[PDB]
Amino acid sequence: VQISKKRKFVADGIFKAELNEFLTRELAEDGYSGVEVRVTPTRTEIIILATRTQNVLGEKGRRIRELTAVVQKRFGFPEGSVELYAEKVATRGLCAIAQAESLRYKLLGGLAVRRACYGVLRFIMESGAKGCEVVVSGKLRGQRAKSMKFVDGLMIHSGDPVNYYVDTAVRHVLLRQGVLGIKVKIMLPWDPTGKIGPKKPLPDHVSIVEPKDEILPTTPISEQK
Amino acid sequence: EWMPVTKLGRLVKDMKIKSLEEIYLFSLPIKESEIIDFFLGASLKDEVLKIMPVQKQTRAGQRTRFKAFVAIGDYNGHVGLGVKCSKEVATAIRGAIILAKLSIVPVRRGYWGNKIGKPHTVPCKVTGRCGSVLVRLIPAPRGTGIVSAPVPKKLLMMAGIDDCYTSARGCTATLGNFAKATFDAISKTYSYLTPDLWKETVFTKSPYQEFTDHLVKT
C-alpha cells in the first residue's frame, strides 16, 4: 500500500496534473480558473476556482457529484474520501488562465480577433495588473501565419521574480480555417496583505520612508509629571 | 479632476482668466488641454482627418506606427489641427485630439462687401504654406459657402467661416501638408494688419502680472 516518499510525491504531482487536465478539458466553458488539493489524516479534498459558480454547479448539483464519482472511480482511492468544493476566484482580472479562456471563447464564438485582444487588454488594465502581454498567432488574414503581439504596462522576463511575479497561460482556439495559439503573460502587482499578488517586492526596488518634519529644539524644555 | 501644472493653468482653473482671448492677447503658450476644455469644451467638435500608417525599416521587419491627423474647433471663430503618431490608432487619435486642442487659434472673420450682420468670410485674401502646398483663402459673398476641397473645407467649417473661395497649388494629395497649409492660412487671418487695426494698442495687465498675488498666495 505504501511506497517511499519520493515516489509518493511524484505520484501526487501526477495526480494533480491529471485532475487539472481533466477539469480544464471539461469546465473551461464555465470559466474554469484553477484547482487545489488539501490532505487531512486519511482524507483528501480537492477545491476548484471558477468565475461562474452557478454555471459550474449545474442543475440539482448533479455535476459535482458525477465528476467526484468519476475521479473516485478513475484513481482507485477508497470511496467516500473525495469531495469537491465550489469556490469563486478572488478576481478574474489578475488570473491568466481565466482571461486566456475568456479570449478563447470570444474567439470561438465569432469576433474580430484583434477586437477580442484589445478588449482583453482593456479588461486587464482596468483590473489593476502591473502589466501584461497577449500573443495571438496563426492564420488571420491570408494563408501565411504571423504571430501578433499586444503589450501594456511593463513586463519582466528574467531572474527569479518571474517565478511568482509573472503568470503564464498558453491555450488553443479551434477554428474552421486553422488553430490559433494564445499565450498570455500577466504581471501581478506588489500586493501584501491579501496575497492576490506577491507579498514581496521586486528585488531591485528600493523604497525610502519620507523624513518626518519636527520642530528643531533650541533649549531643554521639560515638564514635571 | 484637473490639477494645473503651469501658472496659466492655475489662473484658468481659479477663474482668473475669463476667456481664451486674454490668453491669446499675450501670445502665451497653452500647454494644458484642460484650459481649452474649460473655455470651449462645450462646443468643440473633433474630426479625424486621416489615419496614415508610416513605417521604419529595421533588421527583422518594418516597425509600423499610425499618425492621426485630427481637426477640432467649435464652428465659430476657433479651430485647431493636431498630428500625433503612435503604435496604436486609438492612442494616436487621443494624442492628436490633445494636440489639436493645444493648437487652437482665434479665427478673424470679415465681410465680403457691405457689413450687415455678423462676419461671414475671411477679412482678406490669406495664404498658408506647408511643404509645396499653398492654400489661398479669398473672401466670398454671403451665402456661397465654402468653395474648396474637402480637407480645407472641414477646417474652414470648423473655424466658423460661413463662405470662402479657395485655391490650392502643389501636392495637395498629401493630406497632412494640405491641412497644415490651410491651418496656416486660417491662423494668418488675425496676424494681418488691416486699416481697421491701425488704432494704437492700449496695453493692459498681463495675466501673470494682474494675478501675481493670487499665484503667490495659492
Partner: peptide, 26 residues
C-alpha cells in the same frame, strides 16, 4: 468601432487596408 482599428493593425498593408482606413473616418 474599435473593430476596424484592431483589424487594421493586424495587416496595415493587407487587402483590407484602404477599406478599414476609410472606415475609421474616410
Amino acid at each position: 468601432f474599435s473593430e476596424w482599428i484592431d483589424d487594421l493593425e493586424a495587416d496595415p498593408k493587407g487587402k483590407f487596408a484602404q477599406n478599414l482606413l476609410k472606415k475609421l473616418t474616410g
